[PDB]
Structure 1
Amino acid sequence: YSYTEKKRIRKDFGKRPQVLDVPYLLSIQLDSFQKFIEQDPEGQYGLEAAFRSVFPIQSYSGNSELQYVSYRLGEPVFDVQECQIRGVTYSAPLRVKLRLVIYEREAPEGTVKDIKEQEVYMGEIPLMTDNGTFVINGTERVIVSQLHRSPGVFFDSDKGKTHSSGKVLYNARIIPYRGSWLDFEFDPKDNLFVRIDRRRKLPATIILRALNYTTEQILDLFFEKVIFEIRDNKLQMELVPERLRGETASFDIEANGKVYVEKGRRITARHIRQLEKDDVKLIEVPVEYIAGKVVAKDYIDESTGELICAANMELSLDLLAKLSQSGHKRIETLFTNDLDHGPYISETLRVDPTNDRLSALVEIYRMMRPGEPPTREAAESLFENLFFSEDRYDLSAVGRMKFNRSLLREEIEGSGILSKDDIIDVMKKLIDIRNGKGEVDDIDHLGNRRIRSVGEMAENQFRVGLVRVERAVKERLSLGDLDTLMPQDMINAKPISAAVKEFFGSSQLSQFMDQNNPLSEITHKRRISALGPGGLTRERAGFEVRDVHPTHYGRVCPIETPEGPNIGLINSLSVYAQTNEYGFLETPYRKVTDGVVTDEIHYLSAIEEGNYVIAQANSNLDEEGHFVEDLVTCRSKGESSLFSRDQVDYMDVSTQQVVSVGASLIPFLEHDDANRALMGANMQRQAVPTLRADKPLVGTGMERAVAVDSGVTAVAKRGGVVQYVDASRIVIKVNEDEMYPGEAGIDIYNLTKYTRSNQNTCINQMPCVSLGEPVERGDVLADGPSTDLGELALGQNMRVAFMPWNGYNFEDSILVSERVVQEDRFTTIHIQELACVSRDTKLGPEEITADIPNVGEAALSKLDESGIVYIGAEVTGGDILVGKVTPKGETQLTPEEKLLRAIFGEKASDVKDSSLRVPNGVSGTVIDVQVFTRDGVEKDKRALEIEEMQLKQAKKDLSEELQILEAGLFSRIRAVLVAGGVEAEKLDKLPRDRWLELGLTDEEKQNQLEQLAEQYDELKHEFEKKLEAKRRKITQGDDLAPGVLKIVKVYLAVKRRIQPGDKMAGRHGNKGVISKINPIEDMPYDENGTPVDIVLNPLGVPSRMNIGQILETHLGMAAKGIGDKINAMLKQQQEVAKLREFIQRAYDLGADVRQKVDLSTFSDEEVMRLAENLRKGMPIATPVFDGAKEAEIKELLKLGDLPTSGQIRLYDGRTGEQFERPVTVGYMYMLKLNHLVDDKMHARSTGSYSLVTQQPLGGKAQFGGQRFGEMEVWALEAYGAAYTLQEMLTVKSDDVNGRTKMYKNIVDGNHQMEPGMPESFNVLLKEIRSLGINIELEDE
């Protein structure tokens, strides 16, 4: 077992052996962005693809072109941490080698007239942190993946558009990655159409007329030929038997002197085999039968040279006679069956008014650019640039792949330009689907939906920037000078940087990280949205998109999704899901060969899945790997049934493969309704990290992964033995073999103490190791905000009893004891930021100073000399935090103030106070002050003090850094030197720098000694050089906004405690607003006088069907029960052997549990440490759909000598008499949500008023008033209360004279209203009057 696991082993009730360990949970973000950067040599991705896509740029003439060579990412100015403090994007410079070649236009290709190579700077690109995030403007943002319609061709068909017709009508759509959509469709009269750029409908064949296709070629392409021979007697027709399906004989078919089909009957399939066996070639056809058929090609009068019958025209008797007259002895017609080969292209050609290529191009032009008189070259260029230009059209690799998949073509790759073959094939397959062979595609299928991650949208935005650049580069290359133009001259970083900086900071998909919890982070990074650019809209989204789809199984979670207006659009990646090289989700499966369930794992997409038959993870297996049941439950073609054991192709990997990471942490998920599982998964994210983190007694074994893979903890980079643990750093001395040859082998982790999160919570880290104890690679060295020894811990477990209590648990209310508030176990720290900016006004600079007018020494007691609070000062609402006073000018006062100031002789100062003070209702402890000053403004005294302290601590930190590293290095030197010459007196008494030139026997000893002499050289160079670098960074100025002289940021730290109103919840979707903090002596108490921490309603469970919370409760009471046994063994100081026996008995308990832990291999110290960690209750793992069963729960309850019914006799706390019938009591894990009533309570009597409408709207301290909407106006109209309404319209909101007059009346003690007319009404009158419409008020 692992070191961090040998100290607290969670008992696992899983039964199915796990065969694939969960992947790194953030690989989507990391892999995507690493594609976006890392230099692709060949298979263009990311920056290389964008450059090769735009460059080279040829000038409009061809005299010169701008050429691309390579790119390189410079080092970021400041690290992630420095950017957080300074508030600046964590980016890296992009530096692109470029070449300007200039050709001579006299000589043919006189290339060497000018060659000009120069590295140019274009844009900065933000970099991803090691945890899948970006530090943009100091705030940590996440860009969520996108699920969009994969590029390619989609055949759809709407049913009942013309509802009177009730006729399904089809359409095909070509959606390129970049470019113009192309939409073929039918219409109720079976007429094909093309809708370019959602413009007007055009007869579809017109597009073919734009591609050099004459009517003969069109009909040669789309139809099938029927041959007529005028064989000297009445229209002998060559017959192909297979064309004779499903027809009626309107004349008697006779060949070889034999009548096969009798006239008047239906042609039958027996007749067709008759004709095939008889090998009939030719049948006589009557001349009246041809009056309906249509001629294929265009037949001329070859006797004279004139035309007879135009192509695609219906033959008649006279036309047939004329054709026979002119020596035409072979005739072609079109096979137009009403069943299988409809006359679609023929009818469309017939309704098409165009007759040649130019007229079709002109029609295209007039549809695309209506009003503009088209020309030859304009029309030709427009149509060619539509689809056949590589710049304005890209189907992309995925697009060409999906296109050929929906065209059954063989080659995966191709070209991003539409061909003629492609439009022809799309038309042909749409015609097929109209006929009946093949069928439409469904859009919700996850083989037609694709994931665009951060690397790919970033690449797209970078390419858009490069286009913006190439415009002006072409403009400058065509006209401007040549020999005096370096490439650096003609590039502008602004257009490129603006594009990338708009995506990373202002995109809909680029959004503030949810940092309420380690789970909330790690599930914001696995989100998958269907909004933003190229996505849907929450109000124009349908129903088919929202509902689950059978292909979501293993790719997207069915449970976790917001339950507001974003119900189905936003959803979370499943646990084991991945993305193909084309962006399609895929899920692992064990291959099955010969019944045996193999160990090798194939990732199947959503399309290569369907045709296989996939067994389930619940299906039992034997040692060999064979199934046990004969009829294994499997699913195939998107639907499930029972199959044989040898008919099975694949198996699922784990029973948690269908759920996401947040729903994988709910225990007993299978016992809860999916409505409550949805709510539980959603609320589990908002849990606030409490003061002390406590493991869940019942978890699902997935907590360790969510904690270690969030990067909220400090995992060891390499093994070794801890050298120095501190509250704020862990120095670990690496093992010998894990140590690279040249370096000291000391890893230093600087834990991040109390730091604001995005949500004003506390990101704190606490070492969980002890000095001088071994550690291995991957071992958690420091807990995070909401972890506990490496396991996630979003909330705390406490004694819940399910029973009503005097109406204090009515309708989801929670009755919480007071022993829960005394123990400060749901107390949360809330760090807050307050900022005061000193600005240059037109009346002069504003000053931050202690001397504040109209304020006594009372308030100024806490400010230091420069006017900034001390660190540690416990402030309360209203206390001054920094003293800022602005220049003030002539204040027009009233004669009475004139008299007042001229009597007491007190003229107010010319300086107004705008000092920053704590917002009302807030207490706290100033824990940090940061001062930012321009580069050019003198630093006040406290800025200098802060600068000195930070400089000194930084210098000391670097000194300790190098001191520890070189101490370990001198240890390495001594260790190598005890080999090959051990010296006692001379070797130690020398200062350790006495090896810079001294030499000993030539082995690896002196080799390392010379290595470390060079290390002396360049590491002194390092020490002083980069120490001066940090000194410069510390003392350098700041790029503040224009007009800002200095900014002071003060960091309170509130400590919020439970109170009535704070929403709590559990993992099973059972919310609750705490109703009463009940005294300890009143809680229902057990038979041993131990009271009950929380009392929950039993009427919440039945109609909600979250039975899990019951089972969990029972299991919790089992787990804690075991702890008590162990507690009574450690408090009675019983031998390690007695504890080992009992603990071992407590692990090997389940039916046939997967886990087996053998305590014979633990040393007695390890057993005692494990027992110390279990004495608060033995934690238990209950995997999601492989849980623990009531048989095992009750064996556990019997192990801890508890009531196997899981339900005890509670006595009342107040009257002391037993509750009549037993109550269920056990430890349920509760979470304090983010809905703290401190933040939700708000009130207002009077305050700010908006500017235009003159109606309540504050927000800074006192927020805007309560909106009294239309529905409430209806309610008051219903009551008949006209006066309450009138005051809520005029004097409470808009009536200015009214509002102030009535404040005066209230203060006088007279409650009366003098209402006028609201401001918004006569604002409306002005706005209507400004439309030239004379609206007035007909006075009396």
Structure 2
Amino acid sequence: RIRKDFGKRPQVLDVPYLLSIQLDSFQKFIEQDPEGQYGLEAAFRSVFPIQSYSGNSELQYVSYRLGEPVFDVQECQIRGVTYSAPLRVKLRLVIYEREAPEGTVKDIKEQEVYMGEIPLMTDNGTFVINGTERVIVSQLHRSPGVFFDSDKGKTHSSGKVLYNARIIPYRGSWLDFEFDPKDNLFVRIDRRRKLPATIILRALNYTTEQILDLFFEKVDLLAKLSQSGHKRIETLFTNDLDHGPYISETLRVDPTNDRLSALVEIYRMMRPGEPPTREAAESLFENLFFSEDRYDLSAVGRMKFNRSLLREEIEGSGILSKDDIIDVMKKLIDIRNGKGEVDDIDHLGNRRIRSVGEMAENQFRVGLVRVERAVKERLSLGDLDTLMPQDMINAKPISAAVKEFFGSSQLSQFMDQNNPLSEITHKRRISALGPGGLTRERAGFEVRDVHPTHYGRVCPIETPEGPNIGLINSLSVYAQTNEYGFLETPYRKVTDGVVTDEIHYLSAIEEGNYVIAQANSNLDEEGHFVEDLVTCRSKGESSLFSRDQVDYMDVSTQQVVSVGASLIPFLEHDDANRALMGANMQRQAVPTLRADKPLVGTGMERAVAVDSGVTAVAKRGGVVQYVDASRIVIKVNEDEMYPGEAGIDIYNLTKYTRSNQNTCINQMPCVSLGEPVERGDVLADGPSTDLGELALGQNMRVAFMPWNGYNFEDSILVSERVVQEDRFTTIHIQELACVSRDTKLGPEEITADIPNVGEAALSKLDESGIVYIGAEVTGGDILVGKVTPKGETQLTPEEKLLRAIFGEKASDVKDSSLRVPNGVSGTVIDVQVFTRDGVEKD
């Protein structure tokens, strides 16, 4: 069968791993065997050394440990237990009687203690809490940094680029150095603590011959700085000094109870007052602390600092000398003269996401430091040398804020198992919901839409239709995120005419700083360009002319479409409206028996069923022993040929089983026995897919022509021949269960031999309590025989009257079995009986 192809447009690179984001990121937190002390170790550096100083007690952290789990693996799926592995840390506590772990005498120390227990990752990369697997989706927010906004009104003031300076560390302080004329200088601290700024500079060692004598010459808007100093008409210098000139004593005048004096006044604002014995009662907050640094050693707050400001002084500020107040005020004037530092609000280069790897950090810290409020309570009751072992730290507190995140958060949802293809697309999205500060419900007409910078980043097509438009989206095919946050997209580089075939992954940060051309641009041999009017763009602004300005071009044209909207035949003929209404409904598909690959395709349906991990993939060569339609076993050649000595690796073929949304997830063996298979070979095809590509629906014929009215509005008639072949059969499957109780009357039991007055309950139940598999009746019958005595096995006289008319036969026990609920019945799949097993059941 000859294969005639048309277009090709060869690509220098293929589609990266779609499930690469949620794999490497989570492996940078646990840190068990590979790395030593980095990820997880950073979590113990925040809580420890936990110091509850109450005399002579200190707890120091050493190292961690990951041993064996709680119990078996195949046992927490039938009880609802999150499979995890406890941790072991070293503690070193000291008693007032000088008892620190360092010797062998009078020095006790424990090394192995298991309390906390965090979940793990397996194969694909999905957690599992309370039986139901949980998946965490990364959200999008504005990266913390120094930006420049605007301010209404004013129309007669100063400030930075425009007006009010607005910075966002993370919690530290909102430094506001605005300028309001008239009299009092407008300056905030943390909220709105209003106070004259004329005494602030005085504290930082600045006389009246610095800020108002060498700055008022270039601007006469210092009516707020020439108030306290009071520099009216030229008069006698000495003997006429005020707050400004002098520093220590300072002028002692003010219409109020207290009195101002620069230095010894910054605290007088808070009534009543107290002696200057506290030189650092608040100044110790703007220095050595998590106030300034927005991340570990300014690993995030670096690009958004030295790039706009000047340089950098230590992680914080320092003692008396503060270079965090002078390096910021120099900007409010710099731009006031002529610079150009405007930051775009709706800019991708200013917003990054937080993968599961990062979310696993901040959520593990808040859960660990939670026990701190419990290790101090058990201390007040402590005796002497008995409060050393695990009599302080508790497992419950630390194992609480960790289980309430992977099952109870705005980023934790159930995976859509309606379609194997819809599975990967569910994680291939980024919700705009999250923090209340980084995300608001305000009217953002210029945000809830698509920006030109999303070209190659986020597919402007695949977006949930409805009120939540623009918020939720999806990742492109050639769109991958690094270890930072921003999305990185391949872009070939050029240098004046010549073009290099080699691509270059670049973030969205420099995307607006540099110019990017078009892929469909003419090009004749690497060296010369064939156009003088290159149609390129420059950060939400399509430019024109000039060929030397560009430095990057689009290598692929598929970078615009997502991973699910690229399977549809002919996209150029489809409108952006229906191109979405055909994708949001595609993820709501359902595996059908009669499933076949569409006659036409694009060649991307195969790469989907592979990365998704639907079909079985062998990891070692060898022949096939059995090929049952429910179990397949492959024997390898690593051990001597022995009936009971070999690499037995049974492949559990999941038959008709449940699902998150009552769907059908089965596999059909496509490989015969005898024929040797190797790595990459498919063992069994997935549910809704043939050979391993698409195959969601099917193809039928059609006599396109109206039918006398019957097809009014979206009304469609279907031939009966289609029903005859039952090509549209979907298995729903439900879930029933019978629970025995210890009633006061008397605990009941399940058995086939029931003292009932009927036989209908005996026809089914015959296998000693349980019933055989597969059959047929109707709703309102008996599934599990139940014998629960009522009325304390004592009949009433007046009752015997009623049954005396319709055959006197009142037995002590009756048949109170669970009847079938209203609706439609169905066959049974499996039957499980746990009559008090010797295992660890609760």
Do these two structures clear the TM 0.5 threshold for a shared fold by scoring above it?
Answer: yes
Question: What range is the shorter-chain TM-score in?
Answer: 0.7 to 0.9
Q: Structure 1 pair 488/612, CA: closer, same or farther in 2 (3 Å)?
A: same
Q: Structure 1 pair 733/903, CA: closer, same or farther in 2 (3 Å)?
A: closer
In the alignment, is the contact (CA less than 8 A) between 1:185 and 1:193 conserved in 2?
yes
Pick aligned residue for 2:84 from 65, 87, 91? 91
Q: Secondary structure at the match of 1:481?
A: coil
In structure 2, what is the Cα distance between the partners aligned to 1:162 and 1:322? 17
Q: Which is further off, 813-822 or 412-421?
A: 412-421
Q: Structure 1 pair 518/328, CA: closer, same or farther in 2 (3 Å)?
A: closer
- CA-CA distance at 1:504 after TM superposition: 0.8
Q: Which is further off, 621-630 or 588-597?
A: 621-630
Residues 67-116 of structure 1, C-alpha deviation per residue, up to 9 Å, x if partnerless? 22222333445677654444321222222233335687799999998462
In structure 2, what is the Cα distance between the partners aligned to 1:550 and 1:349? 59
- CA-CA distance at 1:461 after TM superposition: 1.3
- CA-CA distance at 1:832 after TM superposition: 2.3
- CA-CA distance at 1:536 after TM superposition: 6.0
In structure 2, what is the Cα distance between the partners aligned to 1:739 and 1:16? 52
TM-score (norm 1): 0.53
- CA-CA distance at 1:837 after TM superposition: 2.5
Q: Structure 1 pair 690/421, CA: closer, same or farther in 2 (3 Å)?
A: farther
Q: Structure 1 pair 431/801, CA: closer, same or farther in 2 (3 Å)?
A: farther
In structure 1, what is the Cα distance between the partners aligned to 2:661 and 2:340? 53
Q: What is the aligned residue count?
A: 841
Residues 1256-1303 of structure 1, C-alpha deviation per residue, up to 9 Å, x if partnerless? xxxxxxxxxxxxxxxxxxxxxxxxxxxxxxxxxxxxxxxxxxxxxxxx
In structure 1, what is the Cα distance between the partners aligned to 2:618 and 2:823? 43
- CA-CA distance at 1:501 after TM superposition: 0.6
- CA-CA distance at 1:450 after TM superposition: 1.8
In structure 2, what is the Cα distance between the partners aligned to 1:66 and 1:16? 64
In the alignment, is the contact (CA less than 8 A) between 2:367 and 2:398 conserved in 1?
yes
- CA-CA distance at 1:394 after TM superposition: 7.6
Pick aligned residue for 1:68 from 61, 76, 96? 61
In the alignment, is the contact (CA less than 8 A) between 2:64 and 2:87 conserved in 1?
yes
- CA-CA distance at 1:678 after TM superposition: 1.9
Q: Which is further off, 163-172 or 47-56?
A: 163-172
Q: Secondary structure at the match of 1:401?
A: coil
- Structure 2 residues not aligned, in runs of 5+: none
Pick aligned residue for 2:644 from 731, 742, 749? 742
Pick aligned residue for 1:769 from 667, 671, 680? 671
Pick aligned residue for 1:56 from 14, 26, 49? 49
In the alignment, is the contact (CA less than 8 A) between 1:40 and 1:48 conserved in 2?
no
Residues 204-253 of structure 1, C-alpha deviation per residue, up to 9 Å, x if partnerless? 7888788787877766998778xxxxxxxxxxxxxxxxxxxxxxxxxxxx
Q: Structure 1 pair 137/604, CA: closer, same or farther in 2 (3 Å)?
A: same
In the alignment, is the contact (CA less than 8 A) between 2:639 and 2:646 conserved in 1?
no
Q: Secondary structure at the match of 1:321?
A: coil
- CA-CA distance at 1:802 after TM superposition: 4.2
In the alignment, is the contact (CA less than 8 A) between 1:169 and 1:188 conserved in 2?
no
Residues 349-396 of structure 1, C-alpha deviation per residue, up to 9 Å, x if partnerless? 999999999999999999999999999589538856996669999896
Residues 829-870 of structure 1, C-alpha deviation per residue, up to 9 Å, x if partnerless? 223222233334455545445578988433552234554442
In structure 2, what is the Cα distance between the partners aligned to 1:597 and 1:321? 59
Q: Structure 1 pair 450/747, CA: closer, same or farther in 2 (3 Å)?
A: same
Q: Secondary structure at the match of 1:527?
A: coil
Which residue does the alignment assign to 1:426? Answer: 328
In structure 2, what is the Cα distance between the partners aligned to 1:153 and 1:534? 19
Q: Structure 1 pair 187/661, CA: closer, same or farther in 2 (3 Å)?
A: farther
Which residue does the alignment assign to 1:891? Answer: 793
Q: Structure 1 pair 327/421, CA: closer, same or farther in 2 (3 Å)?
A: closer
Residues 787-840 of structure 1, C-alpha deviation per residue, up to 9 Å, x if partnerless? 221213222233345443334444333443333333333322223222233334
In structure 2, what is the Cα distance between the partners aligned to 1:172 and 1:794? 55
Q: Secondary structure at the match of 1:123?
A: strand
Q: Structure 1 pair 561/47, CA: closer, same or farther in 2 (3 Å)?
A: same
In structure 2, what is the Cα distance between the partners aligned to 1:340 and 1:446? 52
In the alignment, is the contact (CA less than 8 A) between 1:733 and 1:747 conserved in 2?
yes
Q: Secondary structure at the match of 1:450?
A: strand
Alpha-carbon RMSD across the aligned residues, in angstroms, is 6.6
1:197 and 2:99 are equivalent in the alignment: no
In the alignment, is the contact (CA less than 8 A) between 2:480 and 2:487 conserved in 1?
yes
In the alignment, is the contact (CA less than 8 A) between 1:597 and 1:625 conserved in 2?
yes
Pick aligned residue for 2:511 from 609, 619, 623? 609
Q: Secondary structure at the match of 1:814?
A: strand
- CA-CA distance at 1:167 after TM superposition: 15
- The residue correspondences of 1:687-702 to structure 2 (distance < 5 A) are 687-702=589-604
Which residue does the alignment assign to 1:24? Answer: 17
In structure 2, what is the Cα distance between the partners aligned to 1:218 and 1:526? 55
In the alignment, is the contact (CA less than 8 A) between 1:753 and 1:764 conserved in 2?
yes
- CA-CA distance at 1:509 after TM superposition: 0.9
Which residue does the alignment assign to 1:1266? Answer: none
Please identify the structure whose Cα radius of gyration is greater: 1
In structure 2, what is the Cα distance between the partners aligned to 1:428 and 1:152? 18
Q: Structure 1 pair 738/457, CA: closer, same or farther in 2 (3 Å)?
A: farther
Q: Structure 1 pair 935/479, CA: closer, same or farther in 2 (3 Å)?
A: same
- CA-CA distance at 1:875 after TM superposition: 5.2
- The residue correspondences of 1:1121-1160 to structure 2 (distance < 5 A) are none
In the alignment, is the contact (CA less than 8 A) between 1:461 and 1:503 conserved in 2?
yes
Q: Structure 1 pair 37/731, CA: closer, same or farther in 2 (3 Å)?
A: same
Q: Structure 1 pair 795/107, CA: closer, same or farther in 2 (3 Å)?
A: closer
Percent identity between matched residues is: 100
In structure 1, what is the Cα distance between the partners aligned to 2:194 and 2:796? 74
Residues 247-294 of structure 1, C-alpha deviation per residue, up to 9 Å, x if partnerless? xxxxxxxxxxxxxxxxxxxxxxxxxxxxxxxxxxxxxxxxxxxxxxxx
In the alignment, is the contact (CA less than 8 A) between 1:727 and 1:767 conserved in 2?
yes
- CA-CA distance at 1:339 after TM superposition: 31
In the alignment, is the contact (CA less than 8 A) between 1:862 and 1:873 conserved in 2?
no
Which residue does the alignment assign to 2:178? Answer: 185
Q: Structure 1 pair 870/40, CA: closer, same or farther in 2 (3 Å)?
A: closer
Q: Secondary structure at the match of 1:925?
A: coil
In the alignment, is the contact (CA less than 8 A) between 1:720 and 1:775 conserved in 2?
yes
Q: Secondary structure at the match of 1:643?
A: coil
- CA-CA distance at 1:558 after TM superposition: 1.5
- CA-CA distance at 1:14 after TM superposition: 4.2
- Structure 1 residues not aligned, in runs of 5+: 1-7, 226-317, 941-1340
In the alignment, is the contact (CA less than 8 A) between 1:35 and 1:46 conserved in 2?
yes
In the alignment, is the contact (CA less than 8 A) between 1:152 and 1:176 conserved in 2?
yes
- CA-CA distance at 1:124 after TM superposition: 1.3
- CA-CA distance at 1:29 after TM superposition: 1.1
- CA-CA distance at 1:462 after TM superposition: 1.0
Q: Structure 1 pair 776/381, CA: closer, same or farther in 2 (3 Å)?
A: same
- CA-CA distance at 1:473 after TM superposition: 3.5
Which residue does the alignment assign to 2:427? Answer: 525
In structure 2, what is the Cα distance between the partners aligned to 1:814 and 1:436? 69
- CA-CA distance at 1:336 after TM superposition: 25
Q: Structure 1 pair 111/774, CA: closer, same or farther in 2 (3 Å)?
A: closer
- CA-CA distance at 1:329 after TM superposition: 15
- CA-CA distance at 1:689 after TM superposition: 1.2
- CA-CA distance at 1:189 after TM superposition: 8.6
In the alignment, is the contact (CA less than 8 A) between 1:708 and 1:790 conserved in 2?
yes
Q: Structure 1 pair 549/937, CA: closer, same or farther in 2 (3 Å)?
A: closer
TM-score (norm 2): 0.81
In the alignment, is the contact (CA less than 8 A) between 2:800 and 2:808 conserved in 1?
no
In the alignment, is the contact (CA less than 8 A) between 1:875 and 1:925 conserved in 2?
no
- CA-CA distance at 1:514 after TM superposition: 0.7
Between Structure 1 and Structure 2, which shows a larger proportion of helix residues?
A: 1
- CA-CA distance at 1:499 after TM superposition: 0.8
In the alignment, is the contact (CA less than 8 A) between 2:656 and 2:665 conserved in 1?
yes
1:509 and 2:509 are equivalent in the alignment: no
In the alignment, is the contact (CA less than 8 A) between 1:364 and 1:379 conserved in 2?
no
Which residue does the alignment assign to 1:307? Answer: none
Q: Structure 1 pair 691/107, CA: closer, same or farther in 2 (3 Å)?
A: closer
In the alignment, is the contact (CA less than 8 A) between 2:124 and 2:613 conserved in 1?
yes
- CA-CA distance at 1:452 after TM superposition: 1.1
- CA-CA distance at 1:331 after TM superposition: 13
1:364 and 2:357 are equivalent in the alignment: no
Pick aligned residue for 1:155 from 134, 145, 148? 148
- CA-CA distance at 1:727 after TM superposition: 1.9
1:679 and 2:672 are equivalent in the alignment: no
Residues 1156-1210 of structure 1, C-alpha deviation per residue, up to 9 Å, x if partnerless? xxxxxxxxxxxxxxxxxxxxxxxxxxxxxxxxxxxxxxxxxxxxxxxxxxxxxxx
Pick aligned residue for 1:459 from 354, 361, 365? 361
- CA-CA distance at 1:166 after TM superposition: 17
In the alignment, is the contact (CA less than 8 A) between 1:619 and 1:627 conserved in 2?
no
Q: Structure 1 pair 841/120, CA: closer, same or farther in 2 (3 Å)?
A: same
- CA-CA distance at 1:64 after TM superposition: 4.0
Q: Structure 1 pair 635/157, CA: closer, same or farther in 2 (3 Å)?
A: same
Q: Which is further off, 477-486 or 323-332?
A: 323-332
Residues 1304-1326 of structure 1, C-alpha deviation per residue, up to 9 Å, x if partnerless? xxxxxxxxxxxxxxxxxxxxxxx
Q: Structure 1 pair 521/161, CA: closer, same or farther in 2 (3 Å)?
A: farther
